[PDB]
């Protein structure tokens, strides 16, 4: 058999909707998705840290280090 | 058998909805998804963290270090 | 069998709506995404660190050292 | 079977909607994206750093190195 | 099999809309994109760093450094 292999999605008529086979992988931190729909309305805020892995080895090593967002300022505006 | 494999989804007529197969990964901090749907409304805000891993192996290391964020302003305005 | 392979998406009369197959990436820190809608409205902000991997080997190394945003000043205006 | 090889997608009648397929790869950090669409409105303000990565090997090595954005200012107008 | 190789796209009556087949690649920090719509509107601001990479091999060696935006100013004015 194989190693770390993915099949497809969504052929011979696909259907249905998701998020499958992720693999040390990150999604969000602000963000908004949509389709096929009517009228749709969203609003998304973050402040935010994300960190992931898949298949890690070491000796005498450092892997992965993350120091967060700091000291920071931000402004938006109306939608009419 | 295989090492680490993962089948696909919503093929030869595929149906439903859903989160699947995830190995070691991070789904969220601030997200909105919305999918074949009528006049849908959302809301998200988030002040967070994530830390995720799959298969680790380590000697005389220091592996995922992680600081989360500090001492920001954030300010997000209306929709009509 | 192979090694780190990903079958196709959409094909053959393709259909439905998602993420899939992803290995060690990155999706978001303020981002839209809008299809085949009538309508849409969308609203993002973020303040945010993302950090991801897929086979990592390391022997009397550092790999990955991430230090986040820091003092920084944003403003953005109205959309009528 | 082979190494690191990616199926295509849309082909012989292709539809539906997504991201798919990625490996050691980065989407986001303030981005708009529309489609067969309807009056669509968005907006997108984002203060990041992001570190992506697959298949990795080092020996007495350094390997990526990011210190994000400090001490900047912006200022973005209005849209009737 | 081979090494490294992506099919085609949007072949033999095409359709559907994405992102797919990347690899160790980077797509944002202040971008749209808009296409077969009617009356799109769109904004984006980004203040940011991105680092990706895919199959890397090192000894006695150090690879990718980055040293983000520092001390700048800007202003964009308005549309009517």
Do not use: E
Request: proline share 2%; net charge positive; aromatic share 6%.
């Amino acid at each position: 058999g194989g190693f770390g292999n993915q099949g497809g999605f969504g052929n011979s008529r696909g259907g249905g909707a998701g998020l499958g086979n992720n693999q040390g992988s990150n999604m969000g931190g602000g963000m908004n998705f949509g389709a096929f729909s009517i009228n749709p309305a969203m609003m998304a805020a973050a402040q935010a840290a994300l960190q992931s892995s898949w298949g890690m080895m070491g000796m005498l090593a450092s892997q992965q280090n993350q120091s967060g967002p700091s000291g920071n300022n931000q402004n938006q505006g109306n939608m009419q």
